[model samples]
Target: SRLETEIERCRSECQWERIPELVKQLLIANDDMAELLLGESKLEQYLKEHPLRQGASPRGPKPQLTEVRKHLTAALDRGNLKSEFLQESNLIMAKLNYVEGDYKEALNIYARVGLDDLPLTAVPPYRLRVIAEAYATKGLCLEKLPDREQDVITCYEKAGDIALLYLQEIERVILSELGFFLETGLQRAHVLYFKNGNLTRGVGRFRELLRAVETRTTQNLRMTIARQLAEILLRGMCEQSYWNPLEDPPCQSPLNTKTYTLTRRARVYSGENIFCPQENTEEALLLLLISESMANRDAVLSRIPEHKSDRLISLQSASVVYDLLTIALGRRGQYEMLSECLERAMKFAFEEFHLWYQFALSLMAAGKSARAVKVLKECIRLKPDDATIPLLAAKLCMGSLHWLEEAEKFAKTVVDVTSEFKAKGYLALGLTYSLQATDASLRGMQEVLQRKALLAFQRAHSLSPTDHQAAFYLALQLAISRQIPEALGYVRQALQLQGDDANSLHLLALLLSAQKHYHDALNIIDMALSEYPENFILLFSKVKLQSLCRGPDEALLTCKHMLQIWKSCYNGPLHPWMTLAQIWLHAAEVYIGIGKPAEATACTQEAANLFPMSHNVLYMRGQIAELRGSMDEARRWYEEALAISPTHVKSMQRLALILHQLGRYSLAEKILRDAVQVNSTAHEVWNGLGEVLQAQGNDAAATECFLTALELEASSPAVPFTIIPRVL
Candidate 1:
């Protein structure tokens, strides 16, 4: 109360210079009561001097300084600088420095005094930003030293730190300004880093930011972040072999067409101008190539614009386009366009081994075997060390005996340079040996050829133990050598490695049948038949095996099925029709055995119709007529078969039998002797000859013929005549 009256008297006399010394003394004395009295007294005097309404009582009624002591303590405890009594004093000093043009000093004073020293519960974030700005200004001032380069760096660092703090304080404000927090800010930071030529760091920061956004528990945020990350990875980092997060199991979602479209657009935009220095932007260029190729091919070929024809130039322009279009056409079995594209690619880049190889394959697929051979040979000339070209040449050789010598020479070359071309060389050599073994007159060389082929296949098998072709060939050679047990074992191994291999199963069936394991053979055939239901080879093999194993009944059923397939599926003139006619003849023989003469006759007639010129069918028809007691018809059919093929052995024998039964003895004897001469080793013909001689009462000549028949039919049931009579 005494201080208030003293300050009022001093201010009333315009003696403000006397106030500071009194306040300092009070503060030093540690007298809270006096300090409070002085602080409130000065605040009232200052407020009255700078009253809200101008000239409204320069000396307001003096208030007790102690009365406002609680307000001062509360303001200090709350860190409310605006409500503090001492804050007015600091503001006055700051304003005096500012008026003197000493901005640095003013900034320092404002930073030190205007900021609350004590904790404040009600202080707004904006006030903290203002304080941070003051610190930043001080940092700027520190950066002005001429020789203090390190200090300048430190100042910048400090300024950045203050700026970051201010950023945090104003986070809500900035976030509100941007629509989205993590996505927008992180994306902006990424763009900024990329613009500043810090790609590595930018990519790292973008990845971290993406993860942060993904961790948010909202679906929209997660999807948005995922899409954005995918876009950036696909586009901005296109040169980096960017892997889509969607490719990962964790990020995969049900396809949303709208979102996918938007994602693609984002990627396109990100990579639009991004030039990869090393490879001329491989991903972008590849995409453009694919798009252009698709457009060119999808549009009319006549509509294609002419351009430069340099290999790399055309390839660079059309590589992806051609590749994609070729794949699409290949999938649809459009071999014509596929071949054209492949040829174009090869012609454009003749030195490219892959293009040439693909062209060869397409030619082979299109059944242009000669063209394929030429292309493959050209490829070999271009790349002689390429083992595949020689191997392909050998395979082409397998289909024709005319190419055998060439194939053998090529295969030998492959084997001679065996170090670099191990597996294929061995395989080619094995195929050559197998082809050589097909000649019947070469029987003396069978063992040597078989051994050489087996050794080659073994080498191939050893080179690539898992090679299916090598295993298959090895099994086949073993079967050919009559090493049935070893062949069966190898086939089993191949089947185990690849259960769906129809060829292996079929080979195994053959091996079993050769070993007389007919039941097991039938089972193997049936298993393979399921996968390849329409496979003609399997069907024919199954029918033959059934006839050999069970009886004529099942064989007839299979034959009928095969006949239907041949009649319906085969539109062109193929040799399988001959096999089908043979099957019908076998079916007719089965019908005759079952005492179904009419059914046998009908089958014989059907076989005749399918193959009117076939000697086998004509012979079968003669048998059917004879079985039905149509002797004249049987003789006519026999004559027809003999006219078509003079060496129709069955027809000759049957015709002789019919003539003898009709009491035409001399004619029967002449025909029987003529048939025997045609196939001298035929036991049935020899037996027929013995029967004719016996009919003429020439017992000695009959006995000699019968003895020859017995020698030829040593394993037949009608072995000795004495044994045959007992059974009859």
Candidate 2:
């Protein structure tokens, strides 16, 4: 009895190497149980070396198989002493028959054994294996005979249930492995369900297997099913057409095969606290999260060349989960969380360009600009020939990061590589130089950078004549250089390529204002507003024109409208602090136009509250104080503005005038001279310098400064070209 139990345990665990010696240890020589055990062991050992294919039938019984038959027949002839041995011997013989291409013979053996009628309750692990294998064998025979689809699937379902249970039970005692036959039974049924055009049942079966309580042997199987089911849900269903896992599936749908009652079912994962997803995306996200964790655990971080295959296998597996996670999270617009999830995948990303690129994209989408640029630099290094990678890095650098020198380097890298995007590379380099020109403190340096930017933009326009951005930036550079007629010609060309481009339309109006055509420029702004009614840039220009043409009353009404528009747009989310601050400053300028210093002071205070350290806000405060005739307070505000931004030309000019009024003539002359050094193109600064020189009784110098100020004033636009954002 002890020997029989030990042999059965070995058989259930598929310890084929130990079975024969255990059978031999039995003291009795002619035991029928011993004969049956010997036959099963011999067949298993033979099959281990020459495994059966799913559809490849054997030509004939071999010598070892014949030996197995003799032992099984001899044991059966004496009438097995136990019903368990009889059933197991019959199942094994049927399986052997199926392997040898005797389909009808295998079916007959299953009929005689009453395989379906056998009770699943209180069965030992060895009997469970034999029974599950029997059902799978019968299913295989039915498949070969044809015209038995339902019967074949029913056999497989039965086999899968018992095999899962067998796997669960034996793992509690000691781990066991599945044979090829049982493993096929577990996977084949759902595949057939899909093949038969029953996606509903196919997904149902996948969920069923996934919900089963897992054992040590089932981890791989669970991971595969979880990923597959998530893919199916993402591909086949939408939020309006989904059912929760715990809810009853649609009774009639495009996706199933039929079902029947089973004698036993696999143990399932369940508890009161178990999470149930309420939406399709929620369910898909949950399943992918599970798959990602398991896939992470199996990653091979070893760098040895001998483990190359293992590393690739791990990479492919993890990448599938990550790709699915991206789809699910992207559909829900959850890139902030997706970025954190992709960071975990970086451990598998050594020298991997795809993973690094994807992580960088997630970071960019989540608005993490600085870190995204760092990651994108690595992508550019890994894929040097790709033009888009360096372009993306350049875009980030030129945006809020303001790393203009780094942006120029990235743009230069793209330009050096010969590609179809070379025109775009030149365009990026031009924008970088344009921003750098605005940042330059000295007028000589600013003019040099502006000329370089103009050359780059001209090259970009010549290289890609049909590209709207190239033509647009070229016209903008010409406008900045006071080439009004030429600028107007290129802006029309840019508009022809891409009609209604907002920046191009705005540029056309600014060029008109430079030509002293005030009413015509107002008409262009109004027309552009009809197309893009909420463009704040266009609205700001309209307010300036209104104050000049329609008087200060009309401009004040426009300022009120702008405040309401700002409230509507930015009231509910993360505040756009800089945009709101600029809006308040614009309103303050309109109030200054009407000479209403009290209302103007209120507007400037609001802007100062948002950005207390902003030089522009402090400069506005200085203007409001000057409007109210407080020279001391105005001078203090100007000094504070200049302290925040030492080279603010507007603040320097105004503070110099204040020094002239206070009788500090020498300090006033020095401040005006420094402002002239900072921006020699500013007509207002030169006019103020002329006043200081006249106060010092330097008549010749005063006259020269006056003539330069008047000449420069004739070429100025309503607004500086630098106000238009310089970005790729």
Candidate 3:
């Protein structure tokens, strides 16, 4: 009896390998069930070796099947086997018939065995397995008959239902393997529903399967169905059409009421209070995350040649999950959360370029610029030949990261490897050099970098002559170098290519101002502002033009307009306070120009509240002090401004002027010289240095400094050369 129970346990568990040995031991102990058990094991082992192929009918019965039939028949004819053994033996014979392409015989045998009448309760696990397979095999037999569609689906539904219930009971009692028939049974009903174009029913069946409580044997199945369901949700449904997973099924569905019933239902995931997806994206995201967890568990991290296939499947599954995540989060503009989720996928990202690039882009979209550049560097290493990756790296560097040298290297890599993006490469290189020139302290070094930047922009213009950006940047670089006529010529060409281009129009206005056409420049600014009324850069320039042509009253009105625009700019919303503070500083400059020290101080105080430690704010405070004739107070403010930003050239020049007023010629000359070293083009710094030198009796050197200041002053535009944005 104990041996019989052992046989039943192994068969129930689908541990077919243990059956042959147990059968041998049972033969020595003597029972008619031994022959039937031996026959089942032999058939299982044979099928495992030569697995059944779908859509391929068997040609004939083989030698192995003949032997199994002989063993099964002898046990049946002996009439000494238990009733349960007899039923199991009959089910196996019918399965053999189906495998041998004897569908009619298999149908007849199943009919005779009467699977519908078999009691499901209080049966051994092995008994339930046979009945499940018997139903599955009956479905296979009926598939050959014409016009048996309803019966086919019914058979599969019942088979899957019993199998699910069987798995649940067994899990409470290693997990048993669900055989091929059971696997097909579990998946076939929903597939058939999909084939018939019953989406509502198909989705319904998928949810049913996914909701069933999982077991180790069912994890792979759950992973597959979970992703498949998410795919359907993403592809077919929208928020308006979606239903809650916990609610009753939609009334407008295509399900049949004539479905067969099962004695037992599979245990499912449910609780008194559980999370339920309310919208299509919510459901899809929920399903994908569930699938992702299972996929992560099965990820094969080993690099052995034997596990290559495993690793590949794992990567593909995880990649799909993450890509769907990108789609979902990008729809909601939830990139901050997306980047955090993508970081968890880095384990699957050893040299995986797609995953790395997606992660980097998510970081970029999330406004995590520093980390985005770092991840993009890894992406560049993984896909060195792709110009786009390095270009993104360069763009981020120029945009907010401000790592100019790193950006230069990224731009150069694109130029070195790819011809298709050569024009873009050179443009990025020119932008980098332009910024470097603006930051250079040495006069000769600034000249050399500007020359390099000019040449690079020329090359970019030649490479893509039709591109508006190349022409625009070339014109901008020329304007920065004070080549006014040539800058005007190219800017016209840029406007011709893109007539309403905002940056090109702004550049044309600045160049016009450079040529002493102040009223004409103001006219161009108003025309551009009509089309781009909210452009802060254009608005800032409008205030400057108004100050020059219309005087302080009109300039103050423009500053008020800017303050209104600044309020709406944030309308929600990056360091937004910084932009607000800059607007206040710009307004303070207008007040200072109008000789209103009190009004300027009020504006400067507004900015100080926003950025209390800002050097620009401190410099404004110094300017206000100077206007009030408080020379000592002006000196302290300028000194504090310089302390906050040591290389601030304006602060250094003003501080030097204060020292000159105090008759401290040596210290004044030293501070002026330092200011000139920081920004040689600053005419005020040069003039201050010249005054200090003239005071010290260096008459020849003072004349040279004065001449340099006059020359720079004559060519300079109203705004600094660096005002134009140098972004890629």
Candidate 4:
């Protein structure tokens, strides 16, 4: 008690240097205190050696025992201590050897201080405590060995047995912190788990050890046991790369969004420390996460020194932090801030090739794929051996990232140099060619590019057998090429690997929908939705499939369900104005078809409210008014609709027809003339114009307009069959 009080005072007074001396003095005086001092001294040294390195430095300095036994051995020889007390003395000596890493000697000494050696009733209170502590120390000695760590589980078992044998309940309970001894055993179990993949190799042994500690027992210590458990589970996740993605794309861009905010989440490494330096707080990093438009960045950026890289948080920012920020910012739509941050990160993190690669990708994501491509070329100049750069450049070329004529050039260059990036290089060429095919207006050019895309995707798939992303793309390309029977198996294989991938699953649904097997497609949609229940695209595809099979009623129910989650997918008032009107118009059309004109008028009104300027809404109202037999009111609504959108052919036809019926021939003829000019392709506009003109007695002009209408009716549209690659 005296010794522990002094030890506590020294520690509190910033006198850690005084502990080893005080413990040594106490060790020479009493056997029980010697055992007590040993635990304290070893713990101080343990803390000094193992000060929590945190965030997984799995390769830290392990326990190394000392050579102090030579000095302590001669002094203990002077006391004619009790043979039982002498066992405690020698046991303390063995524990010192254990801490010193003399496991062989420690084991010998620990074995000698056996729990069976003493007479049960005669053993004094302190000797019982001494023996209990000694037995526990012996377990620690056995457990630290590479292969024999599990032997300590027995040592832990014996410790609990010894604690109970002590005569006093409080002292017995205190004897082992048998909870602590059990911890040492469990620690070894985990060490073994890390060495082998089997979490079962004494794996759940942590749970068992803590279970024993608790009933006898433990909870705080139980949590420590739990922490040890959680460590392995997390470490396993990291080992599996469970958090990453495909195409994963070179690193996502932020330019796709409307604001200068990140689409991706910020994943800064706990660099030096997480917060910005106090002096560098002119700009809160939060501003970077937010954007300037109706956002928080303006004030933060204002306080920052204008046009000066030195004032940047990025200058001090961790090199890895920049790429992560680059990803986040580019995803959110702020490449301007990203470039400044990246410039500084580059000054420091030039050694990391990925930062350069990521910078290039950020540029690409910002819709500057040509800039992205240029940056990658610069990266190659800087890192000539980095074969991945050209491969990335090739991908940017093929990706909507910008450059295309050079797309084939970059891909061909990548495959020319190495086999490592050849798969994606083929993939890049495939992407460029396929897109070129989509845009090619010439009859045969589309087929040629589509053919090239198929060949490249096939090559990419062959080279990257494990890349399921490539397989999915290949399957899509196959189906687009019209080889559904061949495409079906590949897409099925792709979904089997990554079924919950929203894009992959939706594509499979689309391909299935096209094939007329809505039954099979329904299950695919339902299965993916089970995982992504609120997923917009998944459910959107889900509802659309119902219209093709099980008809409009089932589709309408899904559409209603789909609208419930409207806010999740919509950014603001439904954009591209006509879109909201179009959806409502479709709903109105369906309502009217189902014999619900009242509901149809309501739906049309709802569309008009959302898109007040959209003339399509006015046209729908006119149609509804005409259906209700309010001819004059219908004429007024159609005239209003045409005034807003003078070229609205349907509105033009209706208004002119009403005028002609009312015998206002000149007015109807003038309105009809405006209609044909607005949409030359609409035969109704020309037909209506001819009728109005003839009524107005302009016989020759009416003949011309009528002939044009007949000519348009007689003319055949040049519809070419969809040309495709051979895979489908």
The prediction achieving the highest TM-score against the true structure is 2
lDDT of 1 by residue, 1-728 (tens): 68656654444333445656665544433333343335545544544564233122222223432334343454444552334435533443343333233556655765666433523333344333333333333333343222333332222323333333333334433344211222222343445445656444444433333323211122333233333443343445543344332222222321101111110000111245643323213333333333444434333332236633433444553454455545545545777767776765554554666667878888877767778888888887788777767777777776642476677777876765544366878787886777665432333465567688889889888898677778877877766555667767888888878988767777777766655678887887888888788877677677667777777778788888977887777765566767677667767877876668888888878777878878888787777787888999999999998899776567878888888778888888887777765545456776777888888899998999889887655422111111100000
Candidate 2's C-alpha runs over 4 A off are: 1-18, 25-30, 47-50, 418-420, 572-575, 696-701
lDDT of 2 at 198: 67
Clashing pairs in 2: 199-255, 200-255, 201-256
Give candidate 4's error at residue 112 in angstroms: 3.0
lDDT of each: 0.57, 0.82, 0.82, 0.57
Please give, for residues 1-728, the per-residue lDDT of candidate 3 as tens digits.
Answer: 68657666776677887766876666543457767767877777777787666677675657888888888888887858678678778888878777777867787887787876777777677677778878888888877655466776677877877788778868956443657887778877788878888687677778877778887788989888888888888877887778777665566653343466667678877898878888988887888788778877888864756777768878988888888888888888999889988988888877778989999899988989888888878987888878888888889888877988998999998888734488899999999888888877788898999999999999999898688878888988888777788988899999989889779889988888888789999988998999999988888789888878888888878888877887767563456687777778888888898789888889999899989999999999999999999999999999999999788989999899999989998889788877877778778898999989888888898999999898878778877756888888
Candidate 4's residue-wise lDDT over 1-728, tens digit each?
77556564454333335556775665444444343345445544555655322132223133333222432353356554446545655776675665445767777776667655555454444455556666666766675554243344345434544444432333333443333433443354455455654344332344334323233334333344444443333334232222111111122321011112212211222345444312111112332332221122111232344654643443333332343455445445877667656554444334446657767766665566667778888787678766577777776665555466787677677667644377777877787777777655443676778789899899988888777656877876776665665666887778778766776677666666666667787888888898888775566566556655666687667667656656445645434344445556766765655666688899898888887767778888887887788889889888888778665678988888888788988788787766655545456677788888777678897898888877655431111112212111
TM-score of 2: 0.94
- Candidate 3 runs further than 4 Å off: 1-38, 45-51, 59-64, 67-89, 111-114, 117-123, 174-176, 248-261, 305-307, 349-352, 418-420, 571-574, 689-710
CA lDDT, candidate 1, residue 191: 51
TM-score of 4: 0.41
Root-mean-square deviation per candidate: 22.7, 2.5, 3.7, 17.2
Distance (Å) between predicted and true CA of 411, model 3? 2.5
How accurate locally is residue 656 in candidate 4, as Cα lDDT from 0 to 100?
Answer: 87
Question: In lDDT terms, how accurate is model 1?
Answer: 0.57
